[PDB]
Amino acid sequence: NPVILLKRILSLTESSPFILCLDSIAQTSYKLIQEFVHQSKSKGNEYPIVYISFETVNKPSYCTQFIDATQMDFVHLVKQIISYLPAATATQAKKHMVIIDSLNYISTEYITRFLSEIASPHCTMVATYHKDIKDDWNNNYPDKLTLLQFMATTIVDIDVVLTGTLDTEEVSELLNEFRIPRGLNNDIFQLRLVNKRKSGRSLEYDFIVNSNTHEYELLST
Amino acid sequence: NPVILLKRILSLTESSPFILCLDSIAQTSYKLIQEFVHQSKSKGNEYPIVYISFETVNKPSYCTQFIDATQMDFVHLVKQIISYLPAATATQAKKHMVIIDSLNYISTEYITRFLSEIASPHCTMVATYHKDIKDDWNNNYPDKLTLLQFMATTIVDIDVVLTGTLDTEEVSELLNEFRIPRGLNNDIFQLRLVNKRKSGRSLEYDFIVNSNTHEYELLST
Amino acid sequence: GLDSSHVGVRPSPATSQPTTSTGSADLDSILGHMGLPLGNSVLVEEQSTTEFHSILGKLFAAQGIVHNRIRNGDTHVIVLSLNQMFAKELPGIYKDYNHQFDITTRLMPAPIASELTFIAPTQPVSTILSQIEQTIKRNDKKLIRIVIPSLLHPAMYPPKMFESSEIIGLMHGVRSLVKKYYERVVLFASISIDIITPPLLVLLRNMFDSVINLEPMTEFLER
Amino acid sequence: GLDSSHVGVRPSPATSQPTTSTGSADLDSILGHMGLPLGNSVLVEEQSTTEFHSILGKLFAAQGIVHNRIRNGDTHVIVLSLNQMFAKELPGIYKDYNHQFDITTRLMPAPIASELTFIAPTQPVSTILSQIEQTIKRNDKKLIRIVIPSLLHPAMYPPKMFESSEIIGLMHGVRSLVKKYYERVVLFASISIDIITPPLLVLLRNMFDSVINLEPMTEFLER
Amino acid sequence: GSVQRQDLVLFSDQSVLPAHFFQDSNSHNLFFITHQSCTQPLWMINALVETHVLGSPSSLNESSSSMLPSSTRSHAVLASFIHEQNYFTNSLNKLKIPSNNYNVLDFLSDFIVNNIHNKPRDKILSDVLAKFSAAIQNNPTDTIVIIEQPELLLSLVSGLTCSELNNKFITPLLRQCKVLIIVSNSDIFNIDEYDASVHSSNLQNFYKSSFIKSMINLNLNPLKTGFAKDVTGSLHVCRGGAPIATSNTSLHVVENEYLYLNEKESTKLFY
Amino acid sequence: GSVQRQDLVLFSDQSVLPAHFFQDSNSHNLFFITHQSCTQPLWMINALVETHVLGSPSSLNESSSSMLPSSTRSHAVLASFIHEQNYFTNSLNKLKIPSNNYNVLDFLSDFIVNNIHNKPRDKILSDVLAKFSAAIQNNPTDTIVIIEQPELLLSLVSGLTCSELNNKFITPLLRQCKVLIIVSNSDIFNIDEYDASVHSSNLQNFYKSSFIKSMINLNLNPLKTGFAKDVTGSLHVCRGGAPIATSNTSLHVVENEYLYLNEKESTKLFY
């Protein structure tokens, strides 16, 4: 059943207005993102994809709109996104998928506003935040990652799958000193799905993913 | 011999333009300061004492000038101090002692200027810095304590002498959480004297001090 | 001042002092006063996984509207929130001082703007306090429930409000009103501890008379 | 360009490249070039306990003044410091490329304003670089020793200079001149590591061609 | 239970508040009192008022201590940034302290709205100060001043540093009175897995600073293990960082640890 | 000594720099190269120039790799923020790379004084960018761009954040060329007893960011134990965080560790 669920989130069948992908140098999110695209097409739901780019310089083949955000101010960014989506009040429009390649580039004080502005019944947002890129009220205001995990309706925490001698802890210690070992960024990797149900009772499962054969398996941890 | 030296610094016979006293909640510096006063009078050198106060609300009996600095701006402070001292160029004036009760109250960017301004052949400065009071360029600029130890011609690091079960480490850990044990702030205490000689070769000795019987003993560590 | 034959008020076992029902049967007994004494405040702290604390918030509010609805039991509920569907999500029912509520049934008639008033936390602190004062003063002789459904929810509270002088000034000012009209005012607040730094949480707790921690619902309290 | 029959210049064993004496016998051999190649720079790092590094600073300077004093050996020493008694504390003596100095004897005739020029680090970076350029350009055909007796001494360097864009801009700009007049310029700097944060020290080291650590005097080098 | 009560003693002359701190010509003394949220300090505050105004803390101690042979114009100025005036007047009346012996300054009621909001830092500090000056200048030589939670100003006033608070308020206040008691909440030190943030390092400096200036430091803490019925917490008496200001060099703080039970009516000390 | 030499291989087609990254219509690829102060990257930079302009890195490899059947208008734009132009022209001439095949942009010489001093952040970034645009727009489809130490801008430009550097310079630069090589000094990660300061966390973000955008990452490090005569350091080849931009999904980075000896004349690789 839990593999069924993950397949339902990835195909955008199990609706979730904000899907947060956490990644790192050890295993970036682009493969996971191609799973969303694959499972979407696959399970019949072929939605229009609006791609917001801060660091993606090669326009993905699967997107229908591509916004280069690097030069744009915040409000101007929001206005572009909004103009490609349906009127939040239409009651009769196609569901759009918005992909943001990195939330690290948006100021912490604008994060909630941004999410509030793009939110729409006709829209699902998949955004990635890089766990290892670091950020009068800032002191007390929650850090970007705590904030984003709080706002997300679904969380997908991506990790490397280690074929060698080291585990994920010793590797994060190596990366802290920018010592890059071999065997990172693989076609097979793992993820931890947190899904927030209507009660508030949150589900949480781990999975091995094969971005080559688009096949997932629960992880008996 | 080393006890002779400490007695020479405390009586202001061994001249040292800037004497830095480091202290903490476990053992403040006021007793050490009364040793300077005592040994000064004692060994014949009875100098005029100019006392600068940020947190000393009871005027000490031994001072000849008392400046309440709490209300004063930096330049105005310097001007008061300076007007009570001899002209840095007189070649024929009495040596003055300037006591500052706490350097913690002076901005880090003004510390070197302050020291430069008061410096005078006819003047010795004894100032205390509290080790446990915490402070675009501030990032790279040295912290107050590193700075002050660098500028000092003599350093006197005051520590509590423990009669009970705990040593000075476990006590600093207790104080970090404001858990105050009994048996701090005693008449007998210890200090670590660092003296910077003309070569640069720095001396360093530890001493037990008895502020009751004005008697010191080297510490065989 | 208030009315003596008020059904929402009753002397606590522990003290002579007037108290009111949290709208939560169990919670009342745990407080130690069989309710929340007038002129006091509770802060309910909860982990991320919602929403047991927004439930006690709604119970607390619902309890006050029922009182208002048939002696007497006049009360006015003030909600500091941007979510106005809080008023439509309040549970329905089933001396007359505490009631047993049903989380599945809404309240029979919907609460009117004169029974319950919203105040947005997206305003200056001066303004919020003015509104709360002004609302308290014009509902004179009415028992007053102030509910802050989730203190410092980042979607409702502007970043600048997280500065100490703003949020703690707000809490100090609200606490000041609670003590000023101790005759008839009471305050309930909840907060999610996963988005609050420990220093700020320490400051916050100090403005409240009692603090309740919920771990899943088991209640460990700090009177 | 320079003169070939210049006594302060000589090709290094390791390379074809022109080099100069640090004024320190031993130090020259350790550098690996029997000196400091023209168009290069050294940063000497020392612990707090002075002043072995201010000694090598003075040797480096003294070596240049002697050269200037009888073929030829014209040089000009530029000192970035507020302490002008640096010029009066330089050691005296005792091809003619290196000399054995005596730390107890000062230099026989005192250095003239035309042999040595001071520049204060209490100025804007633009200004300091202008002075150094301008001094280099007007002493054309003279070998040029730039000495920075103690980089970032807090008594000489204003707090605002410790901002990265200031001190590293200064060091970048000085390095730019050293490479620009690689024909005849050389740079020696010392610094006390106890008042520099490790990040800044890392930035600083990167502007220099070689870095020498002194532990008491034993020299561990990073070529 | 049936525990063996002890009388509170703070100084070597056997007293809690030596009356000779008060007629002296030039002396200023600071008590620094620290408590956690679960150990309210009210019974201590009221005991000190009682001792100063009536000669002995009847609420704490079984027997009486040596006192002045005639009633004075002894007065207490109580100020709080966290409790309203009713909080003190109600407990002082219950304790039967006559109203003419004290004055309550309320810095909770309408404090943010009237005194902080449209008003710069210096002006806020200057006008708080002024309230104390006026109140003290009634029995200036015979008044005890007690301030509850002045640290709150570090949180309520935007960009207030510890040094400004001391320079512009605390230190000047201490200069205008014979005895100052600062009562401060020490929870900021008591967070499991947490030490030394920037707003809180500014806050913590205030405790280290007050201790350094204090000649005595009293600390109330809860049981380290949990909460009980007939045990409230512990009371530690410690030397401060300053010498006692008197012409009596024999006088010293009598360091001690007590357990105490804070009952509704009375509070009791016991070893 | 008499060691057993290896040829450098970076990709699965057996090449160091696949020429097909260059005639493609829409693709942009980033090499991120990291080195420590004691392991200078010049021999790597010159090898890449040589491979792009002459088809194979004769300075590194014994044998030749498959190349294009005729000479192209292959061009290299070399830029440095830490070395002057003489540094590259002298080594390229020694290596016998013809001058018409490359252009050096010097951001050391008079850079602070002419380009940073009386000049706002955007203008500085905008005018550095513009130098690259002009230079690239000569063989735009066939030019390799190599930038040494752009991180220096984070230290030289007051209040420049990583995100501005990427948004206003790095990312736009990568958009205008086929292959970008960033060469960066990684000493900031190599301080014994030191991690994560604010200026340095801004600096470190640049390395994590560049790696994430890179499809390949090459790292030069010294021996972990000390310094030797006939051993310079190690060379690691790793996947970056980005996919390779080609219509050739079989192509992959061939991860590897080499030891290398950087001799005055030549450099050699060996397992």
Curated annotation (Swiss-Prot), chains A, B:
Domain of life: Eukaryota
Keyword annotations from UniProtKB, A to Z: Cytoplasm, Nucleus, Phosphoprotein, tRNA processing
GO biological process: regulation of translation; tRNA modification; tRNA wobble uridine modification
Metabolic or biological pathway: tRNA modification; 5-methoxycarbonylmethyl-2-thiouridine-tRNA biosynthesis
GO cellular component: cytoplasm; cytosol; elongator holoenzyme complex; nucleoplasm; nucleus; peroxisome
Subcellular location: Cytoplasm; Nucleus
Primary subcellular site in the record, as a coarse category: cytoplasm
GO MF annotations in UniProt: identical protein binding
Keyword Acetylation set for record: no
Protein family: Belongs to the ELP5 family.
UniProt subunit comment: Component of the elongator complex, which consists of ELP1/IKI3, ELP2, ELP3, ELP4, ELP5/IKI1 and ELP6. The elongator complex is composed of two copies of the Elp123 subcomplex (composed of ELP1/IKI3, ELP2 and ELP3) and two copies of the Elp456 subcomplex (composed of ELP4, ELP5/IKI1 and ELP6). The Elp123 subcomplex forms a two-lobed scaffold, which binds the Elp456 subcomplex asymmetrically. In each lobe, ELP2 is tightly sandwiched between ELP1/IKI3 and ELP3. The Elp123 subcomplex binds tRNA through ELP1/IKI3 and ELP3 and can bind 2 tRNAs simultaneously.
Comment field (misc): Present with 3870 molecules/cell in log phase SD medium.
Function of the molecule: Component of the elongator complex which is required for multiple tRNA modifications, including mcm5U (5-methoxycarbonylmethyl uridine), mcm5s2U (5-methoxycarbonylmethyl-2-thiouridine), and ncm5U (5-carbamoylmethyl uridine). The elongator complex catalyzes formation of carboxymethyluridine in the wobble base at position 34 in tRNAs. It functions as a gamma-toxin target (TOT); disruption of the complex confers resistance to Kluyveromyces lactis toxin zymocin (pGKL1 killer toxin). May also be involved in sensitivity to Pichia inositovora toxin.
UniProt-recorded name of the protein: Elongator complex protein 5
Organism of this sequence: Saccharomyces cerevisiae (strain ATCC 204508 / S288c)
Gene that produces this protein: IKI1
Residues of the full protein shown: 7 to 234 of 309
Curated annotation (Swiss-Prot), chains C, D:
Signal sequence annotation: none
Biased composition (Low complexity): 11-24
Localization: Cytoplasm; Nucleus
Complexes and interactors: Component of the elongator complex which consists of ELP1/IKI3, ELP2, ELP3, ELP4, ELP5/IKI1 and ELP6. The elongator complex is composed of two copies of the Elp123 subcomplex (composed of ELP1/IKI3, ELP2 and ELP3) and two copies of the Elp456 subcomplex (composed of ELP4, ELP5/IKI1 and ELP6). The Elp123 subcomplex forms a two-lobed scaffold, which binds the Elp456 subcomplex asymmetrically. In each lobe, ELP2 is tightly sandwiched between ELP1/IKI3 and ELP3. The Elp123 subcomplex binds tRNA through ELP1/IKI3 and ELP3 and can bind 2 tRNAs simultaneously.
Recorded family membership: Belongs to the ELP4 family.
Further comment found in the protein's record: Present with 358 molecules/cell in log phase SD medium.
Protein function: Component of the elongator complex, a multiprotein complex which is required for multiple tRNA modifications, including mcm5U (5-methoxycarbonylmethyl uridine), mcm5s2U (5-methoxycarbonylmethyl-2-thiouridine), and ncm5U (5-carbamoylmethyl uridine). The elongator complex catalyzes formation of carboxymethyluridine in the wobble base at position 34 in tRNAs. It functions as a gamma-toxin target (TOT); disruption of the complex confers resistance to Kluyveromyces lactis toxin zymocin (pGKL1 killer toxin). May also be involved in sensitivity to Pichia inositovora toxin.
Protein name according to UniProt: Elongator complex protein 4
UniProt organism field: Saccharomyces cerevisiae (strain ATCC 204508 / S288c)
Gene giving rise to this polypeptide: ELP4
UniProtKB/Swiss-Prot annotation, chains E, F:
Example GO molecular function: identical protein binding
Disulphide bridges: none
Compartments it resides in: Cytoplasm; Nucleus
GO terms under cellular component: cytoplasm; elongator holoenzyme complex; nucleoplasm
Keywords tagged on the record: Cytoplasm, Nucleus, tRNA processing
Pathway named in the protein's UniProt entry: tRNA modification; 5-methoxycarbonylmethyl-2-thiouridine-tRNA biosynthesis
Family membership noted in the UniProt record: Belongs to the ELP6 family.
Protein's name in the database: Elongator complex protein 6
